[PDB]
Amino acid sequence: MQVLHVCSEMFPLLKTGGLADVIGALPAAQIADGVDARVLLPAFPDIRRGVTDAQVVSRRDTFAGHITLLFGHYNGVGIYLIDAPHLYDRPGSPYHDTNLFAYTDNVLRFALLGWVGAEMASGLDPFWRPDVVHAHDWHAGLAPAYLAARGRPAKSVFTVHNLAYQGMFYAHHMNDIQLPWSFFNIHGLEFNGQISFLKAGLYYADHITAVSPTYAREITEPQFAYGMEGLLQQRHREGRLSGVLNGVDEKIWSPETDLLLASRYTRDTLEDKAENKRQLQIAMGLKVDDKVPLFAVVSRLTSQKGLDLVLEALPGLLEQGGQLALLGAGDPVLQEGFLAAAAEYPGQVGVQIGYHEAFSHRIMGGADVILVPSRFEPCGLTQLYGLKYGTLPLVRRTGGLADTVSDCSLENLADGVASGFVFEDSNAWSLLRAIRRAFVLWSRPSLWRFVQRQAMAMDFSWQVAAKSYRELYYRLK
Numbered sequence: 001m002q003v004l005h006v007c008s009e010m011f012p013l014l015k016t017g018g019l020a021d022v023i024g025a026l027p028a029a030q031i032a033d034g035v036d037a038r039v040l041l042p043a044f045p046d047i048r049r050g051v052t053d054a055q056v057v058s059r060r061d062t063f064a065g066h067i068t069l070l071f072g073h074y075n076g077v078g079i080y081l082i083d084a085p086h087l088y089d090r091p092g093s094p095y096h097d098t099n100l101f102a103y104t105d106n107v108l109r110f111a112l113l114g115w116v117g118a119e120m121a122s123g124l125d126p127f128w129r130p131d132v133v134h135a136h137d138w139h140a141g142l143a144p145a146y147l148a149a150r151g152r153p154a155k156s157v158f159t160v161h162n163l164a165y166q167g168m169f170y171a172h173h174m175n176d177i178q179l180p181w182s183f184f185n186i187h188g189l190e191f192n193g194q195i196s197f198l199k200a201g202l203y204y205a206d207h208i209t210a211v212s213p214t215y216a217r218e219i220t221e222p223q224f225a226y227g228m229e230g231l232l233q234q235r236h237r238e239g240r241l242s243g244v245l246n247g248v249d250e251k252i253w254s255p256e257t258d259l260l261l262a263s264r265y266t267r268d269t270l271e272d273k274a275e276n277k278r279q280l281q282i283a284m285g286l287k288v289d290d291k292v293p294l295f296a297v298v299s300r301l302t303s304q305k306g307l308d309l310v311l312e313a314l315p316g317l318l319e320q321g322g323q324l325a326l327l328g329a330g331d332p333v334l335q336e337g338f339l340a341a342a343a344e345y346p347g348q349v350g351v352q353i354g355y356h357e358a359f360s361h362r363i364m365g366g367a368d369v370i371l372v373p374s375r376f377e378p379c380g381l382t383q384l385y386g387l388k389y390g391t392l393p394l395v396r397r398t399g400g401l402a403d404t405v406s407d408c409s410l411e412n413l414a415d416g417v418a419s420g421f422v423f424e425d426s427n428a429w430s431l432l433r434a435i436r437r438a439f440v441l442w443s444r445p446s447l448w449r450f451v452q453r454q455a456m457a458m459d460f461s462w463q464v465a466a467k468s469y470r471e472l473y474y475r476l477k
């Protein structure tokens with residue numbers, strides 16, 4: 001069984017969110033579970049420089065211009081790179097220019113990603129051809145459409161990591177992407193009078209997967225599907241929609257082995273976590289104090305994540321005696337609101353605006369609680385990292401957060417299953433009840449520790465996820 005993943009990012013070479021983490025760990029896990037998994041990425045500069053043994057496989061002309069298909073290895077996995085300097089050799093984000101504007105040739109940049117995933121099924125590589133083409137998110141959304149246009153020489157799965165990003169392009173671009181004009185239909189890739197790369201992946205894929213069991217159900221609702229629900233409801237009924245939870249990459253996210261930490265520690269030696277906390281307090285400019293709970297955020301700053309609610313609730317949090325440490329970048333309203341909060345409460349609120357990979361480990365390894373108050377959350381990896389690091393997650397019951405965190409209620413405590421704090425509604429009062437829950441658990445240090453050790457007993461394994469993907473791939477054949 002040979003599978004090609006088609007995607008736009010991969011940790012540690014290029015990452016803007018959780019997707020990169022998945023693509024960096026899932027394939028190696030699949031190989032260990034008996035599937036021959038390879039990855040296809042655009043040759044963005046950080047990607048191209050990371051794959052140092054890449055060799056030429058072929059050259060082709062394309063509706064988007066010429067490509068050199070390269071193949072090398074990263075961390076023992078086979079990586080194909082689409083080297084097309086005129087599309088992909090640009091600094092910064094893979095998705096937008098330095099002024100945060102989507103590149104105007106994005107339609108071609110990402111149509112080509114999908115076209116190459118499909119062509120791989122037709123022998124683009126003389127020495128290897130996938131049985132299944134596994135496309136991830138809108139960027140890779142056209143891979144199943146090109147496959148359909150060609151008579152489906154391989155099967156396809158489409159995984160939605162996030163249904164809010166739809167890859168909308170004007171309809172006239174049907175002229176530019178070499179697909180049958182007849183694909184521009186409601187039963188096809190048309191969505192609200194435009195081309196949608198997400199609609200295309202959802203429509204043409206043999207099977208659709210979401211990145212948690214509950215998100216898979218949620219996207220059959222208008223509230224989470226934003227117009228795709230009728231399509232997703234139909235695929236559910238046909239048995240062509242399922243949820244497979246993400247794992248965590250233990251080589252990177254384990255406090256037991258984490259070289260990025262002041263002090264490593266385990267489920268049975270959590271006293272060794274305290275130094276991380278002390279150093280994090282110093283680093284953020286917070287008061288150095290082990291008697292006080294340290295709440296943290298590590299997160300993209302968009303409305304998805306419900307962080308305006310954190311701002312609203314912050315005075316309540318401070319009033320009860322907690323600190324906040326935030327790392328994140330995105331919406332300038334959020335950036336400026338949190339900077340202002342940091343300026344307003346020196347020693348209580350510490351804030352760093354930007355993307356900082358190493359610093360996120362130091363937060364995760366030093367904080368007491370991780371706040372993930374999402375409006376929607378396909379999976380959420382930060383809360384999985386908190387569990388593993390014994391930093392109790394405080395989450396809204398939605399998406400993968402609903403699948404992974406167990407509230408500190410009476411039954412869950414008694415059953416020894418409690419691992420974090422959960423609130424229901426997207427408003428600051430509801431968030432604030434869970435925060436108070438946290439302060440109450442905090443005043444009972446031996447209950448807090450009991451909850452920490454259960455959080456750290458939870459396991460989210462990529463080789464277990466791969467078993468599920470593998471069953472799917474074989475069912476498809």
Ligand SMILES: Nc1ncnc2c1ncn2[C@@H]1O[C@H](COP(=O)(O)OP(=O)(O)O)[C@@H](O)[C@H]1O
Nearest residue numbers: 017018299300328354355356357360380381382
């Ligand atoms: N500002 C940041 N600095 C460093 N890492 C970040 C930052 N923001 C998000 N991350 C990381 O990006 C990944 C986010 O994954 P996830 O929780 O699934 O949410 P999303 O994919 O929606 O961003 C995690 O590894 C998280 O630690």
Ligand SMILES: O=S(=O)(O)C[C@H](O)CN1CCN(CCO)CC1
Nearest residue numbers: 016017018019095161162165167
């Ligand atoms: O905004 S764009 O649609 O132009 C580009 C991406 O959709 C932005 N992303 C990166 C991939 N994502 C999933 C990463 O976990 C979040 C949305």
Ligand SMILES: OC[C@H]1O[C@H](O)[C@H](O)[C@@H](O)[C@@H]1O
Nearest residue numbers: 018019161211378379380381
């Ligand atoms: O699948 C990895 C990540 O993808 C998406 O970007 C989601 O926003 C996030 O919840 C998920 O964990």
